[PDB]
Nucleic acid binder design. Structure first.
Ligand SMILES: [Zn+2]
Lengths: 96, 158, 263, 346
RNA sequence: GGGG
DNA sequence: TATAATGGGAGTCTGATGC
DNA sequence: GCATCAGAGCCCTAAA
């Protein structure tokens, strides 16, 4: 909303449009650097004011929320590599 | 707060990973309050409702328990037998995984008994300790419904 | 015997005693075993035929039952009843789930797959599909029962001071609080040896509290904050629906570097 | 299917006690406690440990757990060992074991027979922030307390004594758990008092009282400032999921910015400030910048004073309090040219 | 509740 | 901590699928 | 057959 200085909602149907165009990098920007990828949005802003190109995005924070919310439901959600080894998307912060 | 413990003995990043002795808080990024899980240790186990109420029940199908049966055990309406220990009810032996009501469980577990109010002042037609048949007359207005040892409760006159 | 020294009935001299005019007569299905000397079993013990009761082994029990030691009548009663193990709740189910050999049940269900009437084969398949899921996955069925309940990190259920100094808080905090209260009260009721009616009431309430936390409204009345009809928003409500995590923050998002105006 | 109705049916399965039976059970409970006291002397054990062991065998094998305060983990081995020491007593001593057992059994029945009393008390406390069953269970907790403290000799009926303990237990429950932000029980009492007072004041005045009118009504110690501070403390939080409007869309939480995590601008600024800060201490010299850098600490917060500074700068100790001035002074001249740090003053 |  | 007190109050229409 | 469940378009504004 305008009163909160809000961003526009790029909703399910808007994502579909970008998919049908095959605009993979525009869509990925929408899903990460222009929203909840915190490292990405911070890093992209820093690049633009320095004249560099925007960096490759990282994990959207709302995916981390989904993972933690599924754990609260006692479901173990694991990101895996091609070797089926776990990949830690919390970068060591949530493991003892 | 980022890299700052609760009581404020260790307030900056030279210590990262230290756990303050006084207040017990790790010095790291405050972002971890989005990540680290806690837990509650239940005293008695509780079923996860998804594996109960999502039809056909996953627990119910594995154990061959209907929707109604699984409800009755989980929500404390009916017993389920793990080890009958030779019990028998209404003449047939109790088989493991049988559902018992509360009355059925009490008859099996604690035995069967009944108490009859002798009209006040009326003296009993039977004596304390004596074995009794069903139908035997205990007092002018009192007839016993079951076999067993009759027991005096509160003698008014000694 | 009585409250005060007077009103006691003391025997004047030698005599024999008779009991008359009882308030009620209690008929118990039990066996009576009188004993002259010391009795070796105390009251409450459970007993099987042949077990020694009193007098160094002379008197023993005939029936299966629960020991009642009468110090007035000088008799050891054994009330006919069994040592049966029958349970209620998730603890019973967790045991039966632990006591599953999934390999065996597969074998049995495969043999059942060899049967006419079509309906028999249909049900054994559905069962066999759950069995095979657990077998292939490596998940133990008793994990569908919770012992430790996870707690979501606090920044995902925040308590924040809004503009006015007022506090705003997530519904999950209240669902957890109900749970914690009931768990703590249950621990206390157990240590203090409450009767089974009370412990049972507490246990079923604990189940409902877990149920509201995970999926509120799914079974039974939705838990609400006091003086509002609004169902509290549980973990299931957060994930699912148009407003859920998937269709609101995941398959679509609000974005930076965007604007809108009239065309 | 209805949790209240189910419980009401189960309590109705225990008949109420006659005056004789009520006194009998109460009598046996008291005698049993005395028996456990005596059994402690004879045996050299702990009265609570004995009591839990007695109680364990009465309730059966079903309930066995560690009890907070008991010296031994109360597992089937210890309850067998300790029970065997109790059963090793001579006939005149061993009778106290039978008494204790019969005491615990009677306690159970007494509690069970009064559950309907708790319901009738709890039903009156609905609507204060605890659900009906929560009120019943807390009421049941008081009933347990009443059975342990009851003196049957005083000839009062049990319902009379219990009611005090049950009411007490529910009221402590309402005061303790009803608030998301927990408030000390005495403070809840003051707040509740403040409420009642305003209700009186408004009923005679035909309008809301001011803070001053309540402060007067509350007596000495109270001014309007204190009435206001107390109401601020009594404010309960509001749900982030409270709907704005009636449609299901938009929640109150959706209108709340996150003030904790730095914004892209803020993150950028902190990086830029650190970058000009080091790129400023080295253009005079890295070393007099090294003495100074140690004094504040970049990501350390190494601010104390004269003492500690005894160590590794490179000089002894008063001198650093000068190169600190010379560090700050050399920084100050060079700054007017590279006046780029002025804008970070906001 | 209005706008497309 | 002691008269006695003992069982609650309240409110559309679709199609798909498991008893 | 009949009950129980989970579905029922998108973006935006303002009011709370
Ligand atoms: Zn600290």
């Amino acid at each position: 909303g305008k009163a909160q200085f809000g961003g526009q909602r790029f909703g399910e149907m808007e994502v579909w449009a970008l998919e049908a165009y095959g605009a993979a990098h525009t869509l990925q920007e929408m899903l990460t650097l222009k929203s909840d990828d915190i490292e990405g949005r911070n890093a992209a802003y820093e690049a633009i004011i320095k004249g560099e190109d925007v960096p490759e995005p990282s994990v959207p924070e709302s995916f981390r929320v989904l993972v933690k919310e599924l754990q609260a439901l006692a479901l173990d959600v694991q990101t895996l590599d091609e070797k089926d080894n776990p990949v830690d998307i919390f970068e060591g912060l949530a493991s003892k | 707060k980022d890299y700052e413990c609760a009581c404020g003995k260790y307030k900056r990043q030279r210590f990262e990973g230290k756990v303050c002795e006084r207040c017990g808080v790790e010095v790291t990024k405050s972002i971890v309050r989005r990540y680290r899980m806690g837990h509650i240790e239940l005293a008695t186990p509780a079923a996860h409702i998804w594996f109960v109420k999502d039809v056909p029940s996953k627990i119910g199908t594995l154990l061959d328990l209907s929707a109604t049966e699984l409800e009755q055990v989980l929500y404390f309406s009916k017993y389920i037998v793990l080890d009958p220990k030779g019990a028998i009810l209404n003449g047939v032996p109790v088989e493991k995984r049988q559902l018992l009501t509360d009355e059925e469980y009490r008859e099996l577990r604690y035995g069967k008994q009944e108490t009859y109010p002798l009209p006040p002042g009326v003296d009993a037609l039977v004596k304390d300790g004596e074995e009794v048949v069903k139908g035997q007359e205990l007092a002018p207005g009192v007839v016993s419904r079951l076999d067993g040892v009759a027991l005096y409760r509160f003698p008014r006159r000694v | 015997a009585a409250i005060d020294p007077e009103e006691e009935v003391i025997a004047e001299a030698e005599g024999v005693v008779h009991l008359h005019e009882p308030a009620s007569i209690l008929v118990v299905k039990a066996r009576v075993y009188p004993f002259e000397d010391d009795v070796e079993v105390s009251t409450g013990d459970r007993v099987a035929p042949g077990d020694v009761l009193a007098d160094g082994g002379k008197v023993k029990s005939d029936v299966y039952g629960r020991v009642e030691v009468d110090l007035v009548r000088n008799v050891v009663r054994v009330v006919e009843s069994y040592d049966i193990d029958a349970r209620m709740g998730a603890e019973a189910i967790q045991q039966l789930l632990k006591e599953l050999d999934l390999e065996a049940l597969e074998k049995e269900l495969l043999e059942e797959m060899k049967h006419p009437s079509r309906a028999r084969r249909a049900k054994a398949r559905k069962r066999l599909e759950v069995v095979r899921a657990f077998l292939d996955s490596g998940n133990r069925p008793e994990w569908m029962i919770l012992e430790a309940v996870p707690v979501l990190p606090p920044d995902l259920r925040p308590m924040v001071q809004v503009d006015g100094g007022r506090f705003a808080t997530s519904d999950l905090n209240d669902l957890y609080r109900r749970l914690i209260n009931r768990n703590n009260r249950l621990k206390k009721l157990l240590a203090q040896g409450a009767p089974e009616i009370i412990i049972r009431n507490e246990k079923r309430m604990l189940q409902e509290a877990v149920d509201a936390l995970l999926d509120n409204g799914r079974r039974g009345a939705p838990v609400t904050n006091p003086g509002s009809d609004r169902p509290l928003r549980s973990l299931t409500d957060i994930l699912s629906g148009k407003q859920g995590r998937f269709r609101q923050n995941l398959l679509g998002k609000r974005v930076d570097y965007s604007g809108r105006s009239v065309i | 299917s209805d949790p209240v109705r189910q419980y009401l049916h189960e309590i109705g399965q225990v008949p109420l006690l006659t005056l004789e039976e009520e006194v009998e059970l109460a009598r046996k409970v008291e005698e049993g406690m005395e028996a456990i006291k005596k059994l402690s002397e004879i045996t050299g054990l702990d009265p609570d440990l004995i009591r839990e062991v007695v109680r364990a065998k009465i309730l059966g094998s079903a309930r066995v757990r560690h009890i907070p305060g008991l010296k031994e983990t109360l597992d089937p081995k210890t309850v067998e060992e300790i029970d065997q020491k109790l059963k090793s007593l001579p006939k005149e001593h061993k009778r106290y074991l039978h008494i204790a057992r019969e005491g615990e059994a009677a306690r159970q029945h007494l509690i069970e027979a009064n559950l309907r009393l708790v319901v009738s008390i709890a039903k009156k406390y609905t609507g204060r922030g605890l659900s009906f069953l929560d009120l019943i269970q807390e009421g049941n907790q008081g009933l347990i307390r009443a059975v342990e403290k009851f003196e049957y000799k005083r000839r009062f009926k049990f319902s009379t004594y219990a009611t005090w303990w049950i009411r007490q237990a529910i009221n402590r429950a309402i005061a303790d758990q009803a608030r998301t932000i927990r408030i000390p029980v005495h403070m809840v009492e003051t707040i509740n008092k403040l409420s009642r007072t305003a209700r009186q004041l408004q009923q005679e005045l035909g309008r809301e009282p001011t803070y001053e009118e309540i402060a007067e009504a509350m007596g000495p110690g109270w001014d309007a400032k204190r009435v206001e501070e107390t109401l601020k403390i009594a404010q309960e939080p509001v749900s982030l999921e409270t709907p704005i409007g009636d449609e299901k869309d938009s929640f109150y939480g959706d209108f709340i910015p996150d003030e904790h995590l730095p914004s892209p601008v803020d993150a950028a600024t902190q990086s830029l400030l650190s970058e000009e800060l080091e790129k400023a201490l080295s253009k005079l010299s890295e070393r007099e910048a090294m003495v100074l850098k140690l004094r504040k600490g970049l990501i350390d917060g190494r601010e104390h004073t004269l003492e500690e500074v005894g160590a590794f700068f490179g000089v002894t100790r008063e001198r650093i309090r000068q190169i600190e001035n010379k560090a700050l002074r050399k920084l100050k001249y060079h700054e007017s040219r590279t006046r780029k740090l002025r804008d970070f003053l906001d």
